[PDB]
Amino acid sequence: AKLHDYYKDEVVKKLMTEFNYNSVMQVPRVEKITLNMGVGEAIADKKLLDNAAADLAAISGQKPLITKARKSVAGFKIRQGYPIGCKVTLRGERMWEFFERLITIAVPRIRDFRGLSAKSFDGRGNYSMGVREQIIFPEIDYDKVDRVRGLDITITTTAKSDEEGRALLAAFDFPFR
Amino acid sequence: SATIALNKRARHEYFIEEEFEAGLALQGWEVKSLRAGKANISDSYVLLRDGEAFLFGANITPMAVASTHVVCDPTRTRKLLLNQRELDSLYGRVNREGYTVVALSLYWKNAWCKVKIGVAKGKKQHDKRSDIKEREWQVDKARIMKNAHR
Amino acid sequence: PRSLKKGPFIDLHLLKKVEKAVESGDKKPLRTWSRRSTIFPNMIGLTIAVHNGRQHVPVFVTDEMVGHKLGEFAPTRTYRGHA
């Protein structure tokens, strides 16, 4: 929670002086961080889901929740109640820890990291964004993983717009372009 | 078993060199006729345009006219599904002097029709005589040897 | 190879052109038609469009090419795979 409090002591002041607010509870706050990993190919091979869950636990110590299918689309040949992918959510201390670790080592990474996309807001400003594989984290071993398991991580916040989320991420030192 | 109309005359009429197990591409009302429906594979040969070695000679009888919108053409040029790796023989050793590749037979492979193709050439009525003479001569030599050695 | 005491084989004209480029301070490429000529250290920092018949291929000569021929950097055949 070191970065948590260190940056929360300053984002409040900066946002309050910038957006012309009237209270401290109306500032955009980081509710949680939600990260899943689509392993939908596990229809024939269920071991892929287990490997993805192990990789996710190694990245952040927790137990991934298997989100079973609900509509069972024929296009992908899936049935409802079958393991398709796995998700996880981090709140508070875990959310801040994951945010710090993820941003710090993901800034120096695979391909011409000239910042990240500034148009990746989900309408309200919860900033879903994707990372290609799991070898990004030193948590995951380089030459021991069977495949690559990226992550579609959403920084679920309280932002009422996209510019407020951009300002909050820039204060949190996000790689914006 | 799963065999369908075959052209065994072309085996005697040509010198089969190599064979291809490539498949055939056909439209509706024809694959059902392959089960029953009087398909005939006579006068079968490839008609390479650029990479489109269609089988040209085949008469498959349409057994119904219940869909009276599409025009029926029993002499349609049927497309052929062959690997590009093995299609090099067909764009290669065909147009030297008289080389052809003809459809020897047609059968089923797990509800899918496979037409066997073969590279060959003509005989000019003098290779046929030599083949028949040798076929008879081996039999005659075996018979006379058996009779002599009792 | 050549005898150590004979010397390099830079062209009459190429030397004049590179001298013109180096005291004029121009960033435009200098096109050359010679292909068996050697390299001199004074061309470091210039763009040379060398001709092989197809295109004037550019060379941004580094400080790591003096003792060889400039033509090694520009092949003439066109092939990067059978298929």
Partner: protein, 65 residues
């Protein structure tokens, strides 16, 4: 939190090639001793022009010019 089902949680030193020392706690197990990080990446810590260069004179200008 639940019982001992969640994996390892121990402090690890995030020492990079440059002079950065961190007290991260994660599950990698052994000490990190990692490599070039955000604090030494050309994204914003300088090197916006120093990403690639025209070689470096070594023993080439020797014995003849």
């Amino acid at each position: 939190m639940k019982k001992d089902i969640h994996p390892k949680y121990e402090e690890i030193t995030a020492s990079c090639s440059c002079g950065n020392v961190m007290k991260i706690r994660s599950t990698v197990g052994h000490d990190l001793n990692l490599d070039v990080c955000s604090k030494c990446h050309p994204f914003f810590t300088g090197k916006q022009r120093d990403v690639a260069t025209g070689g470096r004179v070594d023993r080439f200008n020797k014995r003849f010019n």
